[PDB]
Structure 1
Amino acid sequence: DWVIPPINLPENSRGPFPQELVRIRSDRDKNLSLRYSVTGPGADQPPTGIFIINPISGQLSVTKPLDRELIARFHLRAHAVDINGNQVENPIDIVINVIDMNDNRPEFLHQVWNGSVPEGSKPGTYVMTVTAIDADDPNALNGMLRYRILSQAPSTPSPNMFTINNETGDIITVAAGLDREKVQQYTLIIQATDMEGNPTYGLSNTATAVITVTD
């Protein structure tokens, strides 16, 4: 059977509601006198009443701003009986996909990671891996994040003893001169702006790390 073309709607619509879309209707009204209704979540079920369908005509409409993070796609189903309450057309399916929008800053799991790194270690050594997550869609720039170190402290010897794999997020050293008696531990702030690190559309957020130099 031919399948009904999916309506794609982005969350956080700005109304006014009800918004207009498709007009699902049966060609029986060519002599008959139909009447419609919808079913399934958003219709006659939780959120009950988000998708309404003008009994007559068939305009299919949505009554509120949506959010992909609660329900991404809707599997509604339209029906049609004639005024003598028969049943002329088998219920047809309808899919309302909800498209992603970057409306979720990235969280960092632990807001305070900890770790160590040996005494005076050769550069490029691996110290620890911090990570973050983003509720927005993963195969999307709204869910693709990148990490960077905003600050280090103490500021000596070199005010940049570490680095962090912009993609995977594991701290690495690039400078030498680590001495647990000259500096027992470091405190770094870690940012993780999303949108593929994009600075003017990515939503940032932070967490910090304490690197304990091993003796």
Structure 2
Amino acid sequence: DFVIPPINLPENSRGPFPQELVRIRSDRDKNLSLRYSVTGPGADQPPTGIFIINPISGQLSVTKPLDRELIARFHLRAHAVDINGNQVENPIDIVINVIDMNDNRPEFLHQVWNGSVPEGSKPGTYVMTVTAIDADDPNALNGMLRYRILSQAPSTPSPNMFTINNETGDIITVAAGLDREKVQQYTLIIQATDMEGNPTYGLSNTATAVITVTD
């Protein structure tokens, strides 16, 4: 059987509500007066009453904004009965897809990450890994993260002792002169940004990396 095409609806709709979607009817209406209903999560199951259908026309509507991070897809069924109570069609599958909007900023697992690097390490020495997560769709830009260092303290012998791999979160030395007797700890502020790290449209968050110089 051919499947009723899915309805694709972006989350966080402004409305106004209720909002008409599509019209579901039976061709048996040619000789019979029909009554339409819908069942399933979003309809007669939790969360109740988000989608509704006009008993007479079969016009399907949505009554509230949706949130993809709560429910990504709704499986409903449409029902047809005539005015004498006769069931005239087998109930038919309907699919509503909720389309992602970038409505979550990246989140770091820990607010403070700790790591260490030996005294006198050569440039290009691996130090530690920091990472974030994004609650939006991973397969979209809305959930794709990039990393950068915003500040380093203290600023000696070089104000940029480290860099960070912008996709992996790996922190690595790019400079020499790490001496425990001179400077014992560095504090870096790490930023994560979604939308592939786009500075204009991405959402960002920050975290702290503390790096101790060892013997």
Could you tell me the TM-score, scaled by structure 2's length? 0.99
Distance 2:182 2:150 in 1: 23
Distance 1:147 1:84 in 2: 65
Query: How much has 1:118 moved relative to structure 2?
Result: 0.4
Percent identity between matched residues is 100
Query: How much has 1:181 moved relative to structure 2?
Result: 1.2
> What's the secondary structure of 1:45's corresponding residue?
coil
> What's the secondary structure of 1:135's corresponding residue?
coil
Distance 1:36 1:149 in 2: 58
Distance 1:177 1:26 in 2: 79
CA RMSD of superposed structures (Å): 0.5
- What do the CA deviations read for 1:34-86 (whole angstroms, capped 9, x no partner)? 01000001100101100000111111001000000000000001000000111
Query: How much has 1:21 moved relative to structure 2?
Result: 1.1
After TM superposition, where is structure 1 displaced by more than 6 Å over at least 4 residues in a row?
A: none
> What's the secondary structure of 2:108's corresponding residue?
coil
Distance 1:112 1:56 in 2: 60
2:114 aligned with 1:150, yes or no? no
Query: How much has 1:120 moved relative to structure 2?
Result: 1.2
Distance 2:94 2:63 in 1: 16
Distance 2:37 2:197 in 1: 46
Distance 2:111 2:55 in 1: 52
Query: How much has 1:23 moved relative to structure 2?
Result: 0.3
Query: How much has 1:153 moved relative to structure 2?
Result: 0.4
Distance 2:199 2:6 in 1: 34
Distance 1:84 1:201 in 2: 57
Query: How much has 1:22 moved relative to structure 2?
Result: 0.7
**Which sections of structure 2, spanning at least 5 residues, go unmatched?**
none
Distance 1:199 1:209 in 2: 22
Distance 2:163 2:19 in 1: 49
Distance 1:183 1:20 in 2: 65
Query: How much has 1:123 moved relative to structure 2?
Result: 0.4
> What's the secondary structure of 2:153's corresponding residue?
coil
Distance 2:76 2:180 in 1: 64
- What do the CA deviations read for 1:136-173 (whole angstroms, capped 9, x no partner)? 00010000010000010001110000000000001001
**Which sections of structure 1, spanning at least 5 residues, go unmatched?**
none
Query: How much has 1:176 moved relative to structure 2?
Result: 0.5
Query: How much has 1:89 moved relative to structure 2?
Result: 0.5
Distance 1:148 1:198 in 2: 12
> What's the secondary structure of 2:87's corresponding residue?
coil
> What's the secondary structure of 2:168's corresponding residue?
coil
Distance 1:80 1:92 in 2: 9
> What's the secondary structure of 1:205's corresponding residue?
strand
Query: How much has 1:20 moved relative to structure 2?
Result: 1.1
Cross-structure match for 1:20: 20
Count of paired positions:
215
